[PDB]
């Protein structure tokens, strides 16, 4: 149980920034994407740590149709479906060589963590996220929990990523295959390469 916390994933970002004031009506204009998410199902944010499928057997693209990447293929009876909405999700700034910080509360380890970034030309404001929009730009292999960095209430690890040629708004897609079970997590993070 965990997520990409920097650059924060869509659910982690909406939880971190609005969890303390999640019924603030100002959200409808200040952050329309978090507003539609909180209105559709607040548990997508309260359960930010649980965006997983089970039994995928490594066939991530088979299990996750285009336009459903950010909800993990509408996993868990649609809890995270509002993360698939197209629009002006809040970004954080990154550089072309950047680091993805993954936080795991449960110390499951990883069989692998893969980091993809959208290709220049993809428009996150207008277009559903497709597998063909993504390029693999960072990856770690089998990494038992004993090798992750100690945190309060879990462990973390940084995955280097290099996305040459990107400028402006993009999406990072991180796939964590946990080691305790065939359980896989699917994290979209909105970023701006400057
Ligand atoms: Cu877990």
- Report domain extents, the chain: 1-194
Alpha-carbon gap, residue 194 to 98, rounded angstroms: 12
Alpha-carbon gap, residue 33 to 27, rounded angstroms: 9
φ, ψ of residue 57 to 5 degrees: the values are 55, 35
Compute and round to an integer the Cα radius of gyration of the chain: 15
Alpha-carbon gap, residue 114 to 23, rounded angstroms: 34
Q: How far is the CA of 103 from the centre of ligand 1 (A)?
A: 11
Pairing of strands 134-140, 110-118: antiparallel
Cβ atoms of 189 and 93 closer than 8 Å: no
User: Is domain 1-194 in CATH 3.30.70.20, yes or no?
Assistant: no
Q: How far is the CA of 184 from the centre of ligand 1 (A)?
A: 10
Cβ atoms of 48 and 11 closer than 8 Å: yes
Cβ atoms of 3 and 187 closer than 8 Å: yes
Alpha-carbon gap, residue 91 to 9, rounded angstroms: 10
Alpha-carbon gap, residue 149 to 2, rounded angstroms: 14
Q: How far is the CA of 126 from the centre of ligand 1 (A)?
A: 33
Resolution in angstroms comes to 1.1
Cβ atoms of 171 and 188 closer than 8 Å: yes
142 dihedral zone (left: phi>0; alpha: psi -120 to 50; beta): beta
Cβ atoms of 185 and 114 closer than 8 Å: no
Alpha-carbon gap, residue 33 to 26, rounded angstroms: 12
Joined together, the tokens standing for residue 57 give 């057997």
Taking residue 3's Cβ as centre, other Cβ atoms within 10 Å add up to: 25
**Structure determined via:** X-ray
Q: First and final CA of the chain: distance in angstroms?
A: 31
Q: How far is the CA of 121 from the centre of ligand 1 (A)?
A: 35
Q: Which residues of 88-100 are buried (b: 16+ CB within 10 A; e: fewer)?
A: ebbbeebeeebeb
192 dihedral zone (left: phi>0; alpha: psi -120 to 50; beta): beta
Joined together, the tokens standing for residue 45 give 């944010």
Which residues, chain by chain, have CB under 5 Å from ion ligand 1? 1, 106
Alpha-carbon gap, residue 114 to 58, rounded angstroms: 12
């Amino acid at each position: 149980h965990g997520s990409v916390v920097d650059p924060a994933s869509r659910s982690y970002s909406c939880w971190q920034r609005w969890g303390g004031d999640f019924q603030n009506p100002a959200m409808a204009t200040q952050d329309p994407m978090c507003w539609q998410a909180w209105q559709a199902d607040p548990n997508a944010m309260w359960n930010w740590n649980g965006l997983f499928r089970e039994g995928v057997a490594g066939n991530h693209q088979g299990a996750i149709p285009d336009g459903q990447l950010c909800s993990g293929g509408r996993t868990q009876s649609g809890r995270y479906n509002a993360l698939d909405t197209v629009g002006a999700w809040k970004t954080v700034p990154v550089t072309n060589n950047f680091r993805v910080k993954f936080f795991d509360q449960a110390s499951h380890g990883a069989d692998y963590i893969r980091v993809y970034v959208t290709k220049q030309g993809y428009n996150a404001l207008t277009s559903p996220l497709r597998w063909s929009d993504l390029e693999l730009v960072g990856q770690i292999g089998n990494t038992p929990a004993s090798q992750w960095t100690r945190e309060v209430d879990g462990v973390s690890i940084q995955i280097p990523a290099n996305a040459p040629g990107r400028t402006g708004r993009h999406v990072v897609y991180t796939i964590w295959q946990a080691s305790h079970l065939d359980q896989s997590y699917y994290l979209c993070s909105d970023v701006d390469f400057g």
